[PDB]
Amino acid sequence: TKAVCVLKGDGPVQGIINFEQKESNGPVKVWGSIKGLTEGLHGFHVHEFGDNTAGCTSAGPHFNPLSRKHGGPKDEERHVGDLGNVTADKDAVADVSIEDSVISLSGDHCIIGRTLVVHEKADDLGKGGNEESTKTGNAGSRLACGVIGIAQ
Amino acid sequence: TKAVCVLKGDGPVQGIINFEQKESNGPVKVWGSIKGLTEGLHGFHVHEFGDNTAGCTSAGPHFNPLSRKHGGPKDEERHVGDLGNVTADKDAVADVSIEDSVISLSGDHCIIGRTLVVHEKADDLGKGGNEESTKTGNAGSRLACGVIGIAQ
Ligand SMILES: [Zn+2]
Ligand SMILES: [Zn+2]
């Protein structure tokens, strides 16, 4: 099982993120490259809808099938789409390499048909002390997104 | 259950296609419009992979989970992703309104996460006489496509 996503936005952020899940209930490897990002941390999430009619805005909130509060990937309390942050180097490139066991490429937690979004700022992983933190992690605006599709 | 698709290409072709299915075992309504199409008939299909890393080229062939020959949407012998043709009027616009009961927004005929493609030439619905007909319907190149995503 494999998925893929082309990230595009109004600005210069763009990239290709690959998803792989060998076992139906195994972790998903998420890897790829994103360019045009400012050096530092950027929120990285799977949002609810694969709707790009109004750009990244129509993607809705973080995919949250269990109605839980926003958290970091390692947390028990977190949205299914909470993959944390990705880091861009001084050259504006983030060589993404994540492995997650909460998102899936099948079943109730499937992210295929939804939207991957890389955000403006760092995800505070829900430790910012306010409602925003436990909702979006204060990661800011959506710099680029794409709908997650089936791949071979 | 709903889905949506934003079609884009290297040329002027662009549009938005909607999908609706009130019953998991019922038919799927498909509607919207595509502009930039030369007046006439255009192949309209769901291709296997929702991979746009190489534009529409990486989408693969027509979604064909049952391994059948290419056909028209109303043919018993068809590819699940075979939606026939759409018609662009003199204003280079195709107003799409389709109802199909082979494709689904769930289950094994699920097209969510796959790619919708609008073609260059008309689809000869697989009655063209040559091999290429029972494979692609001779619909020519892919002018625009998009990954089908879950919509609110
Ligand atoms: Zn979240
Ligand atoms: Zn076909």
DSSP result, B14-53: EEEEEEE-SSTTS-EEEEEEEESPPSEEEEEEEES----E
**Cα separation, B128 vs B43, whole angstroms:** 14
Nearest to B53 by CA among A120, A152, A50: A152
CA distance B73 to A16: 33
Q: Beta strand pairing status for B93-100 and B28-35?
A: antiparallel
- Contact assessment for residue B44 and residue B72, using Cβ atoms and an 8 Å cutoff: no
The answer on whether B109 is annotated among ligand-binding residues is no
Buried b (16+ CB within 10 A) or exposed e, A52-88: beeebebbbebbbeeebebbbbebeebbbbbbbbbeb
Which residue in A79, A72, A95, A3 sits closest to A46, CA to CA? A79
Q: Say how far apart CA A17 and CA A4 lie, in whole Å.
A: 6
Task: Let me know the angle formed at the C-alpha of B16 by B12 and B21, rounded to the nearest 5 degrees.
Answer: 155
CA distance A62 to A51: 13
* DSSP codes joined into one string, chain B: -EEEEEEE-SSS-EEEEEEE-SSTTS-EEEEEEEESPPSEEEEEEEES----EEEEGGG-SB--TT------TT-SS--TTEEEEEEE-TTSEEEEEEEESSSBSSGGGB-TTSEEEEESS---TT-SSSTTHHHHTT--SEEEEEE-EEE-
Whether residue B31 lies within 8 A of chain A, CB to CB, comes out as no
Experimental method of this PDB entry: X-ray
Residue A69 sits at φ, ψ, to 5 deg, of -85, 155
At what resolution in Å was this solved? 2.4
Give yes or no for B61 touching A (CB within 8 A): no
Integer Cα distance of B104 and B120 in angstroms: 25
Long-range residue pairs from A14-18, CB within 8 A, at least 24 positions apart, any chain: A14/A144, A15/A94, A15/A96, A15/A118, A15/A144, A16/B53, A17/A96, A17/A116, A17/A146, A18/A151
- Cα–Cα distance, B104 to B23 (Å, whole number): 10
B47 is in an annotated binding site: yes
Q: Which residues are A87's β-sheet partners?
A: A41
* The pairing of beta strand A115-119 with beta strand B82-88: unpaired
Judge residue B12's burial from the number of C-beta atoms within 10 Å of its C-beta, 0-12 exposed, 13-18 middle, 19 or more buried.
exposed
B152 to chain A, closest Cα gap in Å:
7
Establish whether A42 is a catalytic residue.
no
Q: How many CB atoms lie within 10 A of CB B43?
A: 27
A53-56 and A2-7 beta bridge pairing: unpaired
Q: How far apart are the first and last CA of chain B?
A: 8
CATH architecture entry for A1-152? Sandwich (2.60)
Which of A14, A33, A51 best tests the B interface by mutation, with the highest count of B CBs <10 A?
A: A51
Interface of A with B in 67-126 (CB under 8 A): 112-115
Q: Are the beta carbons of B49 and A149 separated by less than 8 Å?
A: yes
Cross-chain residue pair A149–B60, CB shorter than 8 Å: no
Residues with CB under 5 A from ligand 1 (ion): A 62, 70, 79, 82
Which residue in chain B has the smallest CA separation from A115?
B149
CA distances (Å), B54 to each of A99, A106, B51, in order? 25, 25, 8
- Give, in degrees to the nearest 5, the angle at Cα A36 between B10 and A87: 130
In the annotation, is A109 catalytic? no
d(CA B39, CA A32): 40
Beta strand B14-20 pairing with B93-100 = unpaired
Q: Please judge whether A113 and B150 are an interchain contact, meaning their C-beta atoms are less than 8 angstroms apart.
A: yes
